[PDB]
Amino acid sequence: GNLWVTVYYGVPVWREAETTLFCASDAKAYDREVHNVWATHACVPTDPNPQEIVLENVTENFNMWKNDMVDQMHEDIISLWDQSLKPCVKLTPLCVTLDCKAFNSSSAMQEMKNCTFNITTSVKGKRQQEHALFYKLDIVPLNKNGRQYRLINCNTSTITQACPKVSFDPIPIHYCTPAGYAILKCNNKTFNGTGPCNNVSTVQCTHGIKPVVSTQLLLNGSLAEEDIIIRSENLTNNAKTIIVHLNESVEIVCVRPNNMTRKSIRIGPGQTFYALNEIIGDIRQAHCNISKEKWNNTLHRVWKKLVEHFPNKTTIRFDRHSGGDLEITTHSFNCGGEFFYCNTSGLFNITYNSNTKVITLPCRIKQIINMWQEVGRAMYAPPIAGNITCTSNITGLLLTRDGGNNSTETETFRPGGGDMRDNWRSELYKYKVVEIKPLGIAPTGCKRRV
């Protein structure tokens, strides 16, 4: 009849908590190829045959918006960029007045500039005039007559050139908990990012995640299994970003077609700077190519999905970005070490009523980079000789709704971004971190002796 307290150790019970985790790269990343930005010696080899355990009859409330290990991901990727940035060459002497002239490009007007400037020689008391090729975006005029120019970051900070051996290829990264912690994965294929998840599993490490840096589009990410997924912290709040997850990728082919040449210039003792020499052949603008019918079907699918979460008899307009800096207004991404800034007006140039051609868009190239919207920390991109082609997969979209006055029966969406944390949020939506509390209490008819 009487009952007694019984202490239980190892109970399968968890609680919500915030903690730090550790990285793990694949073993094949250690077979040479250490000359990569995300190549980390601290990332342990990935555990072979990882264990994913399905927790039947378990319901958990996921929420990826106030989720942890997203700010931690941002801090880790920033620290990795900075640690790769430290051992390379800082371009202090390159803040020198440049005589820049337009490129005739005879057998991209004003985009190419031939700039001559004085560089310090092997003797610190001597200077030599030398030329280089530069873009219009990464240079600014000193005056109004368009003769004297200076670097954009000259009165801001000092650029650090990327070391040429280091490669900007994203690599998969597994996030693993320490002892006493666990990662829960939502196996529900129609999960919208927040709320209960009927099918739950547990893993020691997440799947390999490539840290792809992009805006207005998501590249080389995961894909939804069943249907297009709309994720928002508050759909009626237009100030919050909207993440669109596709069930099928869209092939994107971005090509820099010109033939470059790399010139190594001795700036100081042990300091070599790589400049752009004369272009072999014709000069043409870089571009990206998208199948017209695939993109049209994609837009119709996402329009039909967006009809559900809004009034049905509401027309939907797609428009380009309103304005701002070039980093947000255009699709900025990495392609073979060269950073592309591609105009995206064509893909958002259609409105839908309530009832083998290829779209080709222009792209520009910048060499002075301020990534994660940082001020005072800038990167110089060395050129790559020859031509560059990158074929990738469109697997996600980032959209922003504008504030409509009352109910005008119209809602417009423009491509947004700016927060790279959202770039990790579309891949970490299904994962959450829990803390084990193995101690437990239960009443039982068992009584201890004396």
Partner: protein, 126 residues
């Protein structure tokens, strides 16, 4: 059949009383980056040390589960044994008794100390 990590979490607690060992072995399993791995390993080991000391202070060190002499209070739960051990999961049970974890714990330390000093006094005259 073998059950993995946390595999009996959705199970009833009577069936889940057979798979404590997997959580037991999982509980310790394993410049700046070195600092973080080091600190989090230190965090895991001192969490395990605190849990093991809390088990030891109740006279239940070295045992997977252990009985005590605290009588169960109906104010914590008036539920029957059968519904607890054949229908009731560990998650919502922890949610229920989360109000009285501290009271049950302090009663545990107090009963252990009193019984053990009673044993000391009993053997003192022996």
């Amino acid at each position: 059949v073998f059950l993995g990590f946390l595999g009996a979490a959705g199970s009833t607690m009577g069936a889940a009383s057979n798979t404590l060992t997997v959580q037991a072995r999982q509980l310790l399993s394993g410049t700046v980056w070195g600092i973080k791995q080091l600190q989090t390993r230190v965090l895991a080991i001192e969490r395990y040390l605190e849990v093991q000391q809390l088990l030891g202070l109740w006279g239940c060190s070295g045992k997977l589960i252990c009985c005590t002499a605290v009588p169960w209070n109906s104010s914590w739960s008036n539920k029957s044994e059968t519904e607890i051990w054949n229908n009731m999961t560990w998650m919502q049970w922890d949610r229920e008794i989360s109000n009285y974890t501290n009271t049950i714990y302090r009663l545990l330390e107090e009963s252990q100390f009193q019984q053990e000093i009673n044993e000391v006094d009993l053997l003192a005259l022996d």
